A and B are shown apart, each in its own frame.
Chain A
């Protein structure tokens, strides 16, 4: 490729990739930042960390890289290894593992007018504050903060990329036939914003608002706890003569403890708030403890007309425990259901 080789040799004569392309001393390089989400890899509530595979979409003008295509054999764009041109050091500021940079420095595309477009892949692990309160019915609002590590707002100016129609499509882009959907999280809102500083830097923040799909935790935890609660209820209908009331109640407690061991591998470890499912577990354990205590009281009455008194007390305990259980579970489920992702990403 004679013409491409000659043009490529021409452009990089005296070029310095370490110097930003400001023509005048006071000039700022405008950089458009866009984001394409290829895969939401995971969200981890123990590390408060969201892992994503993305393509950046960075655009800027480097006046040093313009040329007249009619002179250089009609070549109207050029593909150049990114190490050889000046790049804005746009990095993920809120990363969690100390990996600031993109995963692979693929080539930039340079237009004859000097527009440089770069779409590097990145694997990122950003920190994300987790709304543990309504877990597992929760929604999360994770952020990715992109900014130049070095340059000030007086040197590099960030702005959100436009859409294909040229509209101010301030969003994370998601191609329907390419995006690798996640089995546990659904993306609801995906805006972007430019954040002005209050020596200071601008930031571009991309927001993923994602809703947990609750079916797994419903089947594996919530329904077992409902069944255990029903058995703790029917403990009070078992007559004292059966001699299995302690056995039934304590084995119910043991099964609840096994489900607690199950859930403890899943829940977030932070102590800023108590998960509603953890509240439900503690409430169910308290209910089982009270069922044991009241069964012991009924048995202590029975073994003393004392049998009739014991039976009436058992009936009263049955109905009272039914009432308390229904109130508690209804409040818990209503609170878990009425918590919903907001209609606006910035309420």
Chain B
């Protein structure tokens, strides 16, 4: 679920609400309860909890030339399907989809707002964000924020599903918290098993260390499985690492048991098997760990918000008419 605070700037023309200001004491703008005027009745279609409508019914501003401007603020909880593959270095493609259920594409037309520079108009094809007042979220960074009017040619023109406006938030996770609190401890504890081969067989603690590391990995797996949804379409990168690590820890337990079974029969043979299995498993551990983690480290959202569309949907790329 994505929870956002948004201000939805509606604009439309209602010629029934025109007046000459000079006939009414130079009143150029009027503020009215939204219950008085006709509304286009736009709703968040992909909401997650049955809150389809705007939260706070503030006044509409009606200008003398008939323009009706509305800026209702709303709290929305939309359905954002998560992709867990590269977690924690993941990025999510959430969206907010606005449409009318009371009116179809034949009765009202959805369009993006047009701004102007040098008397040339261009559509506002992105989410507006205050460049100085916007407090960034503590865990997510907004990479792209495009907007599209979607029309489905196969839908009937007299159905409400034909047209909508979708605003996309492509957000990136900030991984530092999970690196510090999860990734580094888990990786170091997992790598500690490489020292199990190094510890002398006469110490009598090698299996103890290995099984304790397995227990610690179990605790981390519990924590992460608490923190992530049980999606079965993919395995998270930290989950893949934990599985690989537990597999290797089990294999090191097996090797240690074999080495000790040799030792107490042979001591030089046991030590040689220890060192050989060290020189085998430790580089395999390192290479697998790097292969796993680098796949997430270089994971990034694509430079264009829509693959196969060269347009950037970005403020500096004003697509003038």
Contact = CB atoms under 8 A, between A and B. Distances in A.
Interface in A196-251: 212-217, 219-220, 223-224, 227, 230-231, 234, 237-239, 241-244, 247-248, 251
A34 interface: no
A248 B207 contact: yes
Given A104-B52, A123-B50, A255-B214, A242 B230 contact: no
A178 interface: yes
B215 A121 contact: no
A80 B212 CA distance: 69
A39 B239 contact: no
Interface stretch (A151-159, A179-187, A268-276, A332-340): A179-187
Given A121-B52, A247-B208, A251-B215, A104 B101 contact: yes
Interface residues of A, number: 52
Contacts of A242: 204, 207, 260, 264
Interface string B95-139: 000000111000100000000000000000000000000000000
B284 to A, nearest CB: 17
B204 A261 contact: no
Contacts of A241: 264
Interface of B: 43, 46, 48-50, 52-53, 79, 81-82, 101-103, 107, 152, 158, 161, 204-208, 211-212, 214-215, 218-219, 221-222, 225-226, 229-233, 235, 239, 243, 246-247, 250, 253-254, 257-258, 260-261, 264
Given A178-B161, A258-B218, A213 B233 contact: yes
A216 B102 contact: no
A119 B164 CA distance: 17
A163 B246 CA distance: 52
Nearest to B262: A239
A262 B230 CA distance: 13
B20 to A, nearest CB: 24
A343 B222 CA distance: 36
B232 A227 contact: no
A247 B215 CA distance: 13
Given A219-B243, A241-B264, A248-B207, A41 B48 contact: yes
B299 to A, nearest CB: 19
A265 interface: yes
A107 B205 CA distance: 74
Contacts of A77: 158
A79 interface: yes
A251 B260 contact: no
B317 to A, nearest CB: 28
A86 interface: no
Given A104-B101, A258-B219, A259-B218, A238 B257 contact: yes
Given A104-B52, A242-B204, A237 B257 contact: yes
Given A79-B107, A238-B257, A258-B215, A184 B48 contact: no
A296 interface: no
Given A184-B232, A216-B232, A220-B221, A39 B215 contact: no
A244 B261 contact: no
A103 interface: yes
A119 B83 CA distance: 31
B257 A234 contact: yes
Nearest to A214: B232
Contact of B246 (A214, A227, A243): A227
Question: What are the nearest 10 A-B pairs in CB distance?
Answer: A213-B232, A183-B231, A123-B50, A215-B232, A103-B50, A251-B211, A216-B230, A241-B264, A106-B101, A227-B250
B208 to A, nearest CB: 5
A330 interface: no
A254 interface: yes
28 contacts: A53-B48, A77-B158, A107-B102, A180-B46, A181-B81, A183-B82, A183-B231, A183-B232, A184-B229, A184-B230, A216-B235, A219-B235, A223-B243, A224-B221, A227-B250, A230-B254, A231-B211, A231-B214, A234-B257, A238-B207, A243-B204, A244-B208, A247-B208, A247-B211, A252-B211, A255-B215, A258-B219, A266-B230
